[PDB]
């Protein structure tokens, strides 16, 4: 609804979307992720991957990167996220 | 404005990380950024291109240029 980011997460050969407001840090969003990804039946995970504009997949799990995620988005203000697990 | 930075990625073994370097970032800066991403404090960075064997960002004139040029990077253990 509000200015939140939907974490498109593709774990294995499936897709899961976890919403995370731009006001939260790598935790909440993870806390959010774990809340949506745990359904994969493997582990709560602790790191995520995110597709960059380059056309490849990178990681994200730090305050520095976290800022890159929001900013990388800000540029397009899509309000979503192309995440991937495993 | 508030904090202008660049969106440059990096590749470690089989993983890719993403970092933000301002228009004045030095190598050490760039390197310190990749470290917290990797699982080592002994890692190198290199501009990754069609070959994947570009130049190793060890000096500020490169890392920076990578932030400017938006050059892809590949980090590895040393």
CSV table of N, CA and C in Angstrom, one decimal:
chain,number,residue,atom,x,y,z
A,1,UNK,N,0.8,-1.2,0.0
A,1,UNK,CA,0.0,0.0,0.0
A,1,UNK,C,0.9,1.3,0.0
A,2,UNK,N,1.5,1.5,1.1
A,2,UNK,CA,2.3,2.7,1.3
A,2,UNK,C,3.7,2.5,0.5
A,3,UNK,N,4.6,3.5,0.6
A,3,UNK,CA,5.8,3.4,0.0
A,3,UNK,C,6.7,2.3,0.5
A,4,UNK,N,6.3,1.1,0.3
A,4,UNK,CA,7.1,-0.1,0.7
A,4,UNK,C,7.7,-0.8,-0.4
A,5,UNK,N,8.7,-1.7,-0.1
A,5,UNK,CA,9.4,-2.5,-1.2
A,5,UNK,C,9.0,-3.9,-1.1
A,6,UNK,N,8.5,-4.5,-2.2
A,6,UNK,CA,8.2,-5.9,-2.3
A,6,UNK,C,9.4,-6.7,-2.7
A,7,UNK,N,9.8,-7.6,-1.9
A,7,UNK,CA,11.0,-8.4,-2.1
A,7,UNK,C,10.7,-9.6,-3.0
A,8,UNK,N,10.7,-9.4,-4.3
A,8,UNK,CA,10.5,-10.6,-5.2
A,8,UNK,C,11.6,-11.6,-4.9
A,9,UNK,N,11.3,-12.7,-4.3
A,9,UNK,CA,12.3,-13.7,-4.0
A,9,UNK,C,12.0,-15.0,-4.7
A,10,UNK,N,13.0,-15.4,-5.5
A,10,UNK,CA,12.9,-16.7,-6.2
A,10,UNK,C,13.8,-17.7,-5.6
A,11,UNK,N,13.2,-18.5,-4.7
A,11,UNK,CA,14.0,-19.6,-4.0
A,11,UNK,C,13.8,-20.9,-4.7
A,12,UNK,N,14.9,-21.4,-5.3
A,12,UNK,CA,14.9,-22.7,-6.0
A,12,UNK,C,14.2,-22.4,-7.4
A,13,UNK,N,13.0,-23.0,-7.6
A,13,UNK,CA,12.3,-22.8,-8.9
A,13,UNK,C,10.9,-22.3,-8.6
A,14,UNK,N,10.8,-21.4,-7.6
A,14,UNK,CA,9.6,-20.8,-7.2
A,14,UNK,C,9.8,-19.3,-6.9
A,15,UNK,N,8.7,-18.6,-6.7
A,15,UNK,CA,8.8,-17.2,-6.4
A,15,UNK,C,7.9,-16.8,-5.1
A,16,UNK,N,8.6,-16.0,-4.3
A,16,UNK,CA,7.9,-15.5,-3.1
A,16,UNK,C,8.2,-14.0,-2.9
A,17,UNK,N,7.1,-13.3,-2.6
A,17,UNK,CA,7.3,-11.8,-2.5
A,17,UNK,C,7.1,-11.4,-1.0
A,18,UNK,N,8.1,-10.7,-0.4
A,18,UNK,CA,8.0,-10.2,0.9
A,18,UNK,C,8.1,-8.7,1.0
A,19,UNK,N,7.0,-8.1,1.5
A,19,UNK,CA,7.0,-6.6,1.6
A,19,UNK,C,7.8,-6.0,2.7
A,20,UNK,N,8.6,-5.0,2.4
A,20,UNK,CA,9.5,-4.3,3.4
A,20,UNK,C,9.5,-2.8,3.2
A,21,UNK,N,9.0,-2.1,4.1
A,21,UNK,CA,9.0,-0.6,4.1
A,21,UNK,C,10.4,-0.1,3.9
A,22,UNK,N,10.5,1.0,3.2
A,22,UNK,CA,11.9,1.6,3.0
A,22,UNK,C,12.4,2.2,4.2
A,23,UNK,N,11.6,2.3,5.3
A,23,UNK,CA,12.0,2.9,6.6
A,23,UNK,C,12.7,1.9,7.5
A,24,UNK,N,12.7,0.6,7.1
A,24,UNK,CA,13.4,-0.4,7.9
A,24,UNK,C,14.8,-0.8,7.4
A,25,UNK,N,15.6,-1.3,8.2
A,25,UNK,CA,16.9,-1.7,7.9
A,25,UNK,C,17.0,-3.2,7.5
A,26,UNK,N,18.2,-3.7,7.1
A,26,UNK,CA,18.4,-5.0,6.7
A,26,UNK,C,17.7,-6.0,7.6
A,27,UNK,N,17.5,-5.7,8.8
A,27,UNK,CA,16.9,-6.6,9.8
A,27,UNK,C,15.4,-6.7,9.4
A,28,UNK,N,14.6,-5.9,9.9
A,28,UNK,CA,13.1,-5.9,9.6
A,28,UNK,C,12.8,-6.6,8.2
A,29,UNK,N,13.5,-6.1,7.2
A,29,UNK,CA,13.3,-6.7,5.9
A,29,UNK,C,13.6,-8.1,5.9
A,30,UNK,N,14.7,-8.5,6.5
A,30,UNK,CA,15.1,-9.9,6.7
A,30,UNK,C,14.1,-10.6,7.5
A,31,UNK,N,13.8,-9.9,8.7
A,31,UNK,CA,12.8,-10.4,9.6
A,31,UNK,C,11.6,-10.6,8.8
A,32,UNK,N,11.4,-9.8,7.8
A,32,UNK,CA,10.3,-9.9,6.9
A,32,UNK,C,10.5,-11.1,5.9
A,33,UNK,N,11.7,-11.1,5.4
A,33,UNK,CA,12.1,-12.2,4.5
A,33,UNK,C,11.9,-13.5,5.1
A,34,UNK,N,12.6,-13.7,6.2
A,34,UNK,CA,12.4,-15.0,7.0
A,34,UNK,C,11.0,-15.3,7.2
A,35,UNK,N,10.2,-14.3,7.3
A,35,UNK,CA,8.7,-14.5,7.5
A,35,UNK,C,8.0,-15.0,6.3
A,36,UNK,N,8.7,-14.8,5.1
A,36,UNK,CA,8.1,-15.2,3.8
A,36,UNK,C,8.9,-16.3,3.2
A,37,UNK,N,10.2,-16.3,3.3
A,37,UNK,CA,11.0,-17.4,2.7
A,37,UNK,C,11.0,-18.7,3.4
A,38,UNK,N,11.0,-18.6,4.8
A,38,UNK,CA,11.0,-19.9,5.6
A,38,UNK,C,10.0,-20.9,5.0
A,39,UNK,N,9.1,-20.5,4.2
A,39,UNK,CA,8.1,-21.4,3.6
A,39,UNK,C,8.8,-22.4,2.6
A,40,UNK,N,10.1,-22.1,2.3
A,40,UNK,CA,10.8,-22.9,1.3
A,40,UNK,C,11.2,-24.3,2.0
A,41,UNK,N,11.2,-24.3,3.3
A,41,UNK,CA,11.5,-25.6,4.0
A,41,UNK,C,13.0,-26.0,3.8
A,42,UNK,N,13.9,-25.2,4.4
A,42,UNK,CA,15.3,-25.4,4.2
A,42,UNK,C,16.1,-24.7,5.4
A,43,UNK,N,15.8,-23.5,5.6
A,43,UNK,CA,16.4,-22.7,6.6
A,43,UNK,C,15.9,-21.2,6.5
A,44,UNK,N,16.0,-20.5,7.7
A,44,UNK,CA,15.6,-19.1,7.8
A,44,UNK,C,16.4,-18.1,7.0
A,45,UNK,N,17.6,-18.6,6.4
A,45,UNK,CA,18.4,-17.8,5.6
A,45,UNK,C,18.9,-16.6,6.5
A,46,UNK,N,19.9,-15.9,6.0
A,46,UNK,CA,20.5,-14.7,6.6
A,46,UNK,C,21.1,-13.8,5.6
A,47,UNK,N,21.0,-14.1,4.3
A,47,UNK,CA,21.6,-13.2,3.3
A,47,UNK,C,20.7,-13.3,2.1
A,48,UNK,N,20.6,-12.2,1.3
A,48,UNK,CA,19.8,-12.2,0.1
A,48,UNK,C,20.5,-11.8,-1.1
A,49,UNK,N,20.0,-12.1,-2.3
A,49,UNK,CA,20.6,-11.7,-3.5
A,49,UNK,C,19.7,-10.7,-4.2
A,50,UNK,N,20.2,-9.8,-5.0
A,50,UNK,CA,19.3,-8.8,-5.7
A,50,UNK,C,19.8,-8.5,-7.1
A,51,UNK,N,19.0,-8.7,-8.1
A,51,UNK,CA,19.3,-8.4,-9.4
A,51,UNK,C,19.6,-6.9,-9.6
A,52,UNK,N,20.8,-6.6,-10.2
A,52,UNK,CA,21.2,-5.2,-10.4
A,52,UNK,C,20.9,-4.8,-11.9
A,53,UNK,N,21.1,-3.5,-12.2
A,53,UNK,CA,20.8,-3.0,-13.5
A,53,UNK,C,21.7,-3.7,-14.6
A,54,UNK,N,22.9,-4.1,-14.1
A,54,UNK,CA,23.9,-4.8,-15.0
A,54,UNK,C,23.3,-6.0,-15.6
A,55,UNK,N,22.3,-6.6,-15.1
A,55,UNK,CA,21.7,-7.8,-15.6
A,55,UNK,C,22.1,-9.1,-15.0
A,56,UNK,N,22.8,-8.9,-13.8
A,56,UNK,CA,23.2,-10.1,-13.1
A,56,UNK,C,22.6,-10.1,-11.7
A,57,UNK,N,23.0,-11.0,-10.8
A,57,UNK,CA,22.5,-11.1,-9.5
A,57,UNK,C,23.6,-10.9,-8.5
A,58,UNK,N,23.3,-10.0,-7.5
A,58,UNK,CA,24.3,-9.7,-6.5
A,58,UNK,C,23.7,-10.0,-5.1
A,59,UNK,N,24.5,-9.7,-4.0
A,59,UNK,CA,24.0,-9.9,-2.7
A,59,UNK,C,23.6,-8.6,-2.0
A,60,UNK,N,23.0,-8.8,-0.8
A,60,UNK,CA,22.7,-7.6,0.0
A,60,UNK,C,22.4,-8.1,1.5
A,61,UNK,N,23.1,-7.5,2.4
A,61,UNK,CA,23.0,-7.8,3.8
A,61,UNK,C,23.8,-6.9,4.7
A,62,UNK,N,24.0,-5.6,4.3
A,62,UNK,CA,24.7,-4.7,5.0
A,62,UNK,C,24.1,-3.3,5.0
A,63,UNK,N,24.5,-2.4,5.9
A,63,UNK,CA,24.0,-1.1,6.0
A,63,UNK,C,24.4,-0.3,4.7
A,64,UNK,N,25.6,-0.6,4.3
A,64,UNK,CA,26.2,0.1,3.1
A,64,UNK,C,25.4,-0.4,1.8
A,65,UNK,N,25.2,-1.7,1.7
A,65,UNK,CA,24.5,-2.2,0.6
A,65,UNK,C,23.0,-1.8,0.7
A,66,UNK,N,22.5,-2.0,1.9
A,66,UNK,CA,21.1,-1.7,2.2
A,66,UNK,C,20.7,-0.3,1.6
A,67,UNK,N,21.7,0.7,1.8
A,67,UNK,CA,21.5,2.0,1.3
A,67,UNK,C,21.5,2.0,-0.2
A,68,UNK,N,22.3,1.1,-0.8
A,68,UNK,CA,22.4,1.0,-2.2
A,68,UNK,C,21.1,0.4,-2.8
A,69,UNK,N,20.5,-0.5,-2.1
A,69,UNK,CA,19.2,-1.1,-2.5
A,69,UNK,C,18.1,0.0,-2.6
A,70,UNK,N,18.0,0.8,-1.5
A,70,UNK,CA,16.9,1.8,-1.5
A,70,UNK,C,17.2,2.9,-2.6
A,71,UNK,N,18.5,3.2,-2.7
A,71,UNK,CA,18.9,4.3,-3.7
A,71,UNK,C,18.8,3.7,-5.1
A,72,UNK,N,19.4,2.5,-5.3
A,72,UNK,CA,19.3,1.9,-6.6
A,72,UNK,C,17.9,1.9,-7.1
A,73,UNK,N,16.9,1.7,-6.2
A,73,UNK,CA,15.5,1.7,-6.5
A,73,UNK,C,15.1,3.2,-6.7
A,74,UNK,N,15.4,4.0,-5.7
A,74,UNK,CA,15.0,5.4,-5.7
A,74,UNK,C,15.1,6.0,-7.1
A,75,UNK,N,16.1,5.7,-7.8
A,75,UNK,CA,16.4,6.1,-9.1
A,75,UNK,C,15.2,5.9,-10.1
A,76,UNK,N,14.5,4.7,-9.8
A,76,UNK,CA,13.4,4.3,-10.6
A,76,UNK,C,12.1,4.3,-9.7
A,77,UNK,N,12.3,4.5,-8.4
A,77,UNK,CA,11.2,4.5,-7.5
A,77,UNK,C,10.1,3.5,-7.8
A,78,UNK,N,10.5,2.3,-8.2
A,78,UNK,CA,9.6,1.2,-8.6
A,78,UNK,C,8.8,0.8,-7.3
A,79,UNK,N,9.5,0.7,-6.2
A,79,UNK,CA,8.9,0.3,-4.9
A,79,UNK,C,8.9,-1.2,-4.8
A,80,UNK,N,9.8,-1.9,-5.5
A,80,UNK,CA,9.9,-3.3,-5.5
A,80,UNK,C,11.4,-3.8,-5.4
A,81,UNK,N,11.6,-5.1,-5.4
A,81,UNK,CA,12.9,-5.6,-5.3
A,81,UNK,C,13.0,-7.0,-6.0
A,82,UNK,N,14.0,-7.2,-6.8
A,82,UNK,CA,14.2,-8.5,-7.5
A,82,UNK,C,15.2,-9.3,-6.7
A,83,UNK,N,14.7,-10.0,-5.7
A,83,UNK,CA,15.6,-10.8,-4.8
A,83,UNK,C,15.6,-12.3,-5.3
A,84,UNK,N,16.6,-13.0,-4.8
A,84,UNK,CA,16.7,-14.4,-5.1
A,84,UNK,C,17.4,-15.2,-4.0
A,85,UNK,N,16.9,-16.4,-3.7
A,85,UNK,CA,17.5,-17.2,-2.7
A,85,UNK,C,17.9,-18.6,-3.2
A,86,UNK,N,19.2,-18.9,-3.0
A,86,UNK,CA,19.7,-20.2,-3.4
A,86,UNK,C,19.8,-20.3,-4.9
B,1,UNK,N,19.6,17.0,-3.0
B,1,UNK,CA,20.9,16.2,-2.8
B,1,UNK,C,21.0,15.8,-1.3
B,2,UNK,N,21.9,14.9,-1.0
B,2,UNK,CA,22.1,14.5,0.4
B,2,UNK,C,23.4,13.6,0.5
B,3,UNK,N,23.6,12.8,-0.5
B,3,UNK,CA,24.8,11.9,-0.5
B,3,UNK,C,24.9,11.2,-1.9
B,4,UNK,N,25.6,11.8,-2.8
B,4,UNK,CA,25.8,11.2,-4.1
B,4,UNK,C,26.8,10.1,-4.1
B,5,UNK,N,26.3,8.9,-4.6
B,5,UNK,CA,27.2,7.7,-4.6
B,5,UNK,C,27.0,7.0,-5.9
B,6,UNK,N,27.9,6.0,-6.2
B,6,UNK,CA,27.8,5.2,-7.4
B,6,UNK,C,27.3,3.8,-7.1
B,7,UNK,N,26.8,3.2,-8.1
B,7,UNK,CA,26.3,1.8,-7.9
B,7,UNK,C,27.2,0.8,-8.7
B,8,UNK,N,28.2,0.3,-8.0
B,8,UNK,CA,29.1,-0.6,-8.6
B,8,UNK,C,29.0,-2.0,-7.9
B,9,UNK,N,29.1,-3.0,-8.7
B,9,UNK,CA,29.0,-4.4,-8.2
B,9,UNK,C,30.4,-5.0,-8.1
B,10,UNK,N,30.4,-6.2,-7.6
B,10,UNK,CA,31.7,-7.0,-7.5
B,10,UNK,C,31.4,-8.5,-7.5
B,11,UNK,N,32.3,-9.3,-7.9
B,11,UNK,CA,32.1,-10.7,-8.0
B,11,UNK,C,33.2,-11.5,-7.1
B,12,UNK,N,32.7,-12.3,-6.2
B,12,UNK,CA,33.6,-13.1,-5.4
B,12,UNK,C,33.4,-14.6,-5.6
B,13,UNK,N,34.4,-15.2,-6.2
B,13,UNK,CA,34.3,-16.6,-6.5
B,13,UNK,C,33.1,-17.0,-7.3
B,14,UNK,N,31.9,-17.0,-6.7
B,14,UNK,CA,30.7,-17.3,-7.4
B,14,UNK,C,29.5,-16.4,-6.9
B,15,UNK,N,29.9,-15.3,-6.3
B,15,UNK,CA,28.9,-14.4,-5.7
B,15,UNK,C,29.1,-13.0,-6.2
B,16,UNK,N,28.1,-12.2,-6.3
B,16,UNK,CA,28.2,-10.8,-6.7
B,16,UNK,C,27.7,-9.8,-5.7
B,17,UNK,N,28.5,-8.8,-5.3
B,17,UNK,CA,28.0,-7.9,-4.3
B,17,UNK,C,27.8,-6.5,-4.9
B,18,UNK,N,27.1,-5.6,-4.2
B,18,UNK,CA,26.9,-4.3,-4.7
B,18,UNK,C,27.2,-3.2,-3.7
B,19,UNK,N,28.0,-2.2,-4.1
B,19,UNK,CA,28.4,-1.1,-3.2
B,19,UNK,C,28.3,0.2,-3.8
B,20,UNK,N,28.2,1.2,-2.9
B,20,UNK,CA,28.1,2.6,-3.3
B,20,UNK,C,29.3,3.5,-3.0
B,21,UNK,N,30.0,4.0,-4.0
B,21,UNK,CA,31.2,4.8,-3.9
B,21,UNK,C,30.9,6.2,-4.4
B,22,UNK,N,31.2,7.2,-3.5
B,22,UNK,CA,31.0,8.6,-3.9
B,22,UNK,C,32.0,8.9,-5.1
B,23,UNK,N,31.8,10.1,-5.6
B,23,UNK,CA,32.7,10.6,-6.7
B,23,UNK,C,34.1,10.9,-6.3
B,24,UNK,N,34.5,10.4,-5.2
B,24,UNK,CA,35.9,10.7,-4.7
B,24,UNK,C,36.5,9.5,-4.0
B,25,UNK,N,35.8,8.4,-4.1
B,25,UNK,CA,36.2,7.1,-3.4
B,25,UNK,C,37.6,6.7,-3.8
B,26,UNK,N,38.4,6.3,-2.8
B,26,UNK,CA,39.7,5.8,-3.1
B,26,UNK,C,39.7,4.2,-3.1
B,27,UNK,N,40.8,3.6,-3.5
B,27,UNK,CA,40.8,2.2,-3.6
B,27,UNK,C,40.5,1.6,-2.2
B,28,UNK,N,41.4,1.9,-1.3
B,28,UNK,CA,41.2,1.4,0.1
B,28,UNK,C,39.8,1.5,0.5
B,29,UNK,N,39.1,2.6,0.1
B,29,UNK,CA,37.7,2.8,0.4
B,29,UNK,C,36.9,1.7,-0.3
B,30,UNK,N,37.1,1.6,-1.6
B,30,UNK,CA,36.4,0.6,-2.4
B,30,UNK,C,36.7,-0.8,-1.8
B,31,UNK,N,37.9,-1.1,-1.5
B,31,UNK,CA,38.3,-2.4,-0.9
B,31,UNK,C,37.6,-2.6,0.5
B,32,UNK,N,37.7,-1.6,1.4
B,32,UNK,CA,37.1,-1.8,2.7
B,32,UNK,C,35.6,-2.1,2.6
B,33,UNK,N,35.0,-1.7,1.5
B,33,UNK,CA,33.6,-1.9,1.2
B,33,UNK,C,33.3,-3.3,0.9
B,34,UNK,N,34.1,-3.9,0.0
B,34,UNK,CA,33.9,-5.3,-0.4
B,34,UNK,C,34.2,-6.3,0.7
B,35,UNK,N,35.2,-5.9,1.6
B,35,UNK,CA,35.6,-6.8,2.7
B,35,UNK,C,34.4,-7.3,3.5
B,36,UNK,N,33.6,-6.3,4.1
B,36,UNK,CA,32.4,-6.6,4.9
B,36,UNK,C,31.4,-7.5,4.1
B,37,UNK,N,31.5,-7.5,2.8
B,37,UNK,CA,30.6,-8.3,2.0
B,37,UNK,C,31.1,-9.7,1.9
B,38,UNK,N,32.4,-9.8,1.6
B,38,UNK,CA,33.1,-11.1,1.5
B,38,UNK,C,33.2,-11.8,2.9
B,39,UNK,N,33.9,-12.9,2.9
B,39,UNK,CA,34.1,-13.7,4.1
B,39,UNK,C,35.6,-13.6,4.5
B,40,UNK,N,36.3,-12.6,3.9
B,40,UNK,CA,37.7,-12.4,4.2
B,40,UNK,C,38.1,-11.0,4.2
B,41,UNK,N,39.3,-10.7,4.8
B,41,UNK,CA,39.9,-9.4,4.9
B,41,UNK,C,41.1,-9.3,4.0
B,42,UNK,N,41.3,-10.4,3.3
B,42,UNK,CA,42.3,-10.6,2.3
B,42,UNK,C,41.7,-10.9,1.0
B,43,UNK,N,41.3,-9.9,0.3
B,43,UNK,CA,40.6,-10.1,-1.0
B,43,UNK,C,41.1,-9.0,-2.0
B,44,UNK,N,41.0,-9.3,-3.2
B,44,UNK,CA,41.4,-8.3,-4.2
B,44,UNK,C,40.2,-8.0,-5.1
B,45,UNK,N,40.3,-6.8,-5.8
B,45,UNK,CA,39.2,-6.4,-6.6
B,45,UNK,C,39.7,-6.2,-8.0
B,46,UNK,N,38.9,-6.4,-9.0
B,46,UNK,CA,39.3,-6.2,-10.4
B,46,UNK,C,38.2,-5.9,-11.3
B,47,UNK,N,38.3,-5.0,-12.2
B,47,UNK,CA,37.3,-4.6,-13.1
B,47,UNK,C,36.9,-5.8,-14.0
B,48,UNK,N,35.7,-6.3,-13.9
B,48,UNK,CA,35.2,-7.4,-14.6
B,48,UNK,C,34.6,-7.0,-15.9
B,49,UNK,N,35.1,-7.5,-17.0
B,49,UNK,CA,34.5,-7.2,-18.4
B,49,UNK,C,34.3,-8.5,-19.2
B,50,UNK,N,33.8,-8.3,-20.4
B,50,UNK,CA,33.5,-9.5,-21.3
B,50,UNK,C,34.4,-10.7,-21.1
B,51,UNK,N,35.7,-10.4,-20.7
B,51,UNK,CA,36.6,-11.5,-20.5
B,51,UNK,C,36.5,-12.0,-19.0
B,52,UNK,N,36.5,-11.0,-18.1
B,52,UNK,CA,36.4,-11.3,-16.7
B,52,UNK,C,37.7,-11.3,-16.1
B,53,UNK,N,38.7,-10.8,-16.8
B,53,UNK,CA,40.1,-10.6,-16.4
B,53,UNK,C,40.6,-9.2,-16.7
B,54,UNK,N,39.9,-8.3,-16.1
B,54,UNK,CA,40.2,-6.9,-16.3
B,54,UNK,C,41.4,-6.5,-15.4
B,55,UNK,N,41.4,-5.2,-15.0
B,55,UNK,CA,42.5,-4.7,-14.1
B,55,UNK,C,42.1,-4.9,-12.7
B,56,UNK,N,43.1,-5.1,-11.8
B,56,UNK,CA,42.9,-5.2,-10.4
B,56,UNK,C,42.9,-3.9,-9.7
B,57,UNK,N,41.8,-3.5,-9.1
B,57,UNK,CA,41.6,-2.2,-8.5
B,57,UNK,C,42.4,-2.2,-7.2
B,58,UNK,N,43.6,-1.6,-7.3
B,58,UNK,CA,44.5,-1.5,-6.2
B,58,UNK,C,44.8,0.0,-5.9
B,59,UNK,N,44.6,0.8,-6.9
B,59,UNK,CA,44.9,2.3,-6.8
B,59,UNK,C,43.6,3.0,-6.9
B,60,UNK,N,43.6,4.2,-6.3
B,60,UNK,CA,42.4,5.1,-6.4
B,60,UNK,C,42.0,5.5,-7.8
B,61,UNK,N,42.9,5.7,-8.7
B,61,UNK,CA,42.6,6.1,-10.0
B,61,UNK,C,41.7,5.1,-10.8
B,62,UNK,N,41.7,3.8,-10.3
B,62,UNK,CA,40.9,2.8,-10.9
B,62,UNK,C,39.5,2.7,-10.3
B,63,UNK,N,39.6,2.3,-9.0
B,63,UNK,CA,38.4,2.1,-8.2
B,63,UNK,C,37.4,3.2,-8.4
B,64,UNK,N,38.0,4.4,-8.3
B,64,UNK,CA,37.2,5.6,-8.6
B,64,UNK,C,36.6,5.5,-10.0
B,65,UNK,N,37.5,5.4,-11.0
B,65,UNK,CA,37.1,5.3,-12.4
B,65,UNK,C,36.0,4.3,-12.5
B,66,UNK,N,36.0,3.3,-11.7
B,66,UNK,CA,35.0,2.2,-11.7
B,66,UNK,C,33.7,2.7,-11.2
B,67,UNK,N,33.8,3.7,-10.3
B,67,UNK,CA,32.6,4.3,-9.7
B,67,UNK,C,32.0,5.3,-10.7
B,68,UNK,N,32.9,5.9,-11.5
B,68,UNK,CA,32.5,6.9,-12.5
B,68,UNK,C,32.1,6.2,-13.7
B,69,UNK,N,33.0,5.4,-14.2
B,69,UNK,CA,32.9,4.6,-15.4
B,69,UNK,C,31.8,3.6,-15.2
B,70,UNK,N,31.4,3.3,-14.0
B,70,UNK,CA,30.4,2.3,-13.6
B,70,UNK,C,30.9,0.9,-14.1
B,71,UNK,N,32.2,0.7,-13.9
B,71,UNK,CA,32.8,-0.5,-14.2
B,71,UNK,C,32.5,-1.7,-13.3
B,72,UNK,N,32.3,-2.9,-13.8
B,72,UNK,CA,32.0,-4.0,-13.1
B,72,UNK,C,33.3,-4.5,-12.4
B,73,UNK,N,33.2,-5.1,-11.2
B,73,UNK,CA,34.3,-5.6,-10.5
B,73,UNK,C,34.2,-7.0,-10.1
B,74,UNK,N,35.4,-7.7,-9.9
B,74,UNK,CA,35.4,-9.1,-9.5
B,74,UNK,C,36.4,-9.2,-8.3
B,75,UNK,N,35.9,-9.5,-7.2
B,75,UNK,CA,36.8,-9.7,-6.0
B,75,UNK,C,37.1,-11.1,-5.7
B,76,UNK,N,38.3,-11.4,-5.3
B,76,UNK,CA,38.7,-12.7,-5.0
B,76,UNK,C,39.7,-12.8,-3.8
B,77,UNK,N,39.8,-14.0,-3.3
B,77,UNK,CA,40.7,-14.2,-2.2
B,77,UNK,C,42.2,-14.0,-2.6
B,78,UNK,N,43.1,-13.7,-1.7
B,78,UNK,CA,44.4,-13.5,-2.1
B,78,UNK,C,45.4,-14.5,-1.4
